[PDB]
């Protein structure tokens, strides 16, 4: 049984700006484990039948796990441009996989404030699909070369989410786990 337990039941998910990719293979994957596990505010699968997940074979299954506010879950999809989609985590045009998102307000939001989870607010170039960007050099927004200083005209790129349990339903923290399926000329070791 593939470690859908570890991915979906993580104690603390990764921030979106540095999302943890878990490539799972050489294991039997059951997707009935998804449905029972979490309330799944949004469960959208692109290019795949949600049913045929159980009966289909894939050589590499990618799990991209991160926390985003509910308004930015709709950004996680092919053909979507925004803050998360352009800067932090982007999907290819023909992305084939399941995007899974459930609210985590009682878990990931602290009463004073949760500044652990961050996202990339400023970036020079929109990410190429599935890329990861953890460079934190100060954005050279100002005409002056920023010279690695944070201030006016020069913004520190990661702005904390600052989740709180009482935020609006849109801004409550949703833990998003995104699945991607390769099927290259390899021993296809994920099936049913």
């Amino acid at each position, epitope marked *: 049984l593939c470690p859908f337990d570890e991915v979906f039941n993580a104690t603390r998910f990764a921030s979106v700006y540095a999302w943890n990719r878990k490539r799972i293979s050489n294991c039997v994957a059951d997707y009935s484990v998804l449905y029972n596990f979490a309330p799944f505010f949004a469960f959208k699968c692109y290019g795949v039948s949600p049913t045929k997940l159980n009966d289909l074979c894939f050589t590499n299954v990618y799990a991209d796990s991160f926390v985003i506010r*509910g*308004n*930015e879950v*709709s*950004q996680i999809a092919p053909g*979507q*441009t*925004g*803050n*998360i989609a*352009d*800067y932090n985590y982007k999907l290819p045009d023909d992305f084939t996989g399941c995007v899974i998102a459930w609210n985590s307000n009682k878990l990931d939001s602290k*009463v*004073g*404030g949760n500044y652990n989870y961050r996202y990339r*607010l*400023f*970036r020079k170039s*929109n990410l190429k699909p599935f890329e990861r960007d953890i460079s934190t050099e100060i954005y050279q*927004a100002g005409n002056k070369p920023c010279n690695g200083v944070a201030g006016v005209n020069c*913004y520190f790129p990661l*702005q*904390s989410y*600052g989740f*709180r349990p*009482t*935020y*609006g*339903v*849109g*801004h409550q923290p949703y833990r998003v786990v995104v699945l991607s399926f390769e099927l290259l000329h390899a021993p296809a070791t994920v099936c049913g």
Partner: antibody, heavy 119, light 108 residues
Framework: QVQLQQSGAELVRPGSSVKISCKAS????????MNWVKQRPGEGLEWIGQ????????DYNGKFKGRATLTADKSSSTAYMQLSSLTSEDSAVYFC?????????????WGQGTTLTVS | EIVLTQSPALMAASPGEKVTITCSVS???????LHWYQQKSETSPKPWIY???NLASGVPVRFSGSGSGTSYSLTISTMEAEDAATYYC?????????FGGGTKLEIK
């Protein structure tokens, strides 16, 4: 019916003391976030802070942070803003805006706005 | 700080005519986190478009926002005299909330 009521305008000499009250009627005051918007004369509005009446949680804008203290009373359903070291720039119409709790978050309801004079 | 620029500082319009108000954002923001408020002169602004397409309560059917990514647009198919106002696009993606400079819509 839902509407936010606000205290009248006042004139204050450049100083550290001023208190502006927002009155909330028609809804549970503690449930919905309360945030203040400052509109300088002939300028686009800017966001001062955010106070959750339920527990008193406060978020501030960077420039006003530490200068304006936001607090509310659950009993009387009053949301206050207190500013310090008033300057001629502080003279602006101050709105109290109730951030919506829906899927989209926005300032669904606003106060009539209080005019601060620093002189 | 996310910085919002609105294309017309003022606008001249006529009834029955399309006019568009373009709110250009420095860094792309989720459409769900951009909203438009209508501030008629010397009154409390009321929400007008929230989420770039979802009109608020009491909003006329003529109004309809558009756009996504960096460039956000508000468009009125026909400009009634009631439509004359100043419209402030807001962003909530980046936490220090930055209203637009405003587009003072006036009739020709």
């Amino acid at each position: 019916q839902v509407q936010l009521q606000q205290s009248g305008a006042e004139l204050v000499r450049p100083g550290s003391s001023v208190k502006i009250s927002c009155k909330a009627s028609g809804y549970a005051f503690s449930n919905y976030w309360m945030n203040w918007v400052k509109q300088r004369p002939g300028e686009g509005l800017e966001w001062i802070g955010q106070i959750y009446p339920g527990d008193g949680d406060t978020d501030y804008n960077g420039k006003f942070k530490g200068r304006a203290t936001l607090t509310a009373d659950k009993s009387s359903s009053t949301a206050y803003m207190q500013l310090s070291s008033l300057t001629s720039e502080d003279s602006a119409v101050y709105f109290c805006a109730r951030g919506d709790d829906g899927y989209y978050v926005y300032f669904d309801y606003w106060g009539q706005g209080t005019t601060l004079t620093v002189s | 700080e996310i910085v919002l620029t609105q294309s017309p500082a003022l606008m001249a319009a006529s009834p029955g005519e399309k006019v568009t108000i373009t709110c250009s954002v420095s860094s792309s923001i989720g459409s769900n986190n951009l909203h438009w408020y209508q501030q008629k002169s010397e009154t409390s602004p009321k929400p007008w478009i929230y989420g770039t397409s979802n009109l608020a309560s009491g909003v006329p059917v003529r109004f309809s926002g558009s756009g996504s990514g960096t460039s956000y647009s508000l468009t009125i198919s026909t400009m009634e005299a009631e439509d004359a106002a100043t419209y402030y696009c807001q962003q909530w993606s980046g936490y220090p909330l930055t209203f637009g400079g405003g587009t003072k819509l006036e009739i020709k």
